[PDB]
Every structure is written in structure tokens, then in C-alpha cells.
Amino acid sequence: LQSTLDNIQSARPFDELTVDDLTKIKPEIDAKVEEMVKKGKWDVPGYKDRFGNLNVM
């Protein structure tokens, strides 16, 4: 846990980083995307309840 606290401070894209790098650090990104593309849902459940959706309607 000491190591974990230190690890969070010196490695963490707390400004920004390539989202491709986030795919590189977790294949979970590609997994969720692939299942949604395969499903044909473009609705991401709860994306709009913790990020905007900028509706003009």
C-alpha cells in the first residue's frame, strides 16, 4: 500500500495522456468497445450520468 500510494503519484495521467495508451494499459477499453460494436449499441450505459451528452433537442 505504501508502494501503491507512491505509484499513484508518479504514474497517473492526471493531466492527459493518449487514450490509446489507456487501451495499452487496460485491454478492458477494447473489450467493452468491441462488445458494444458487436452488439450495435452506441448508447454507453451511464455515460450521460457522469459525463455530459450536450443534447440540443
Partner: protein
Amino acid sequence: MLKRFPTPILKVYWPFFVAGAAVYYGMSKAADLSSNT
């Protein structure tokens, strides 16, 4: 930048593509008929 993934689209949009072929053929004949004016 661009992530190409396979989307099922052939097995989604098949009646659209079939309709496209019929109208395409019909427009060949229509173009020929309109050039006879």
C-alpha cells in the same frame, strides 16, 4: 486516431443494398430515356 472495427452491416443493411441495385438499373434506363428528349 482511427480504430477500424468490424460492424455487422452487410447483415443489417441487405434490403437497402438490394433496393439500391434495382433503382441503379432503373436510372440507367431513365438516363437513356431522358437523353431521347
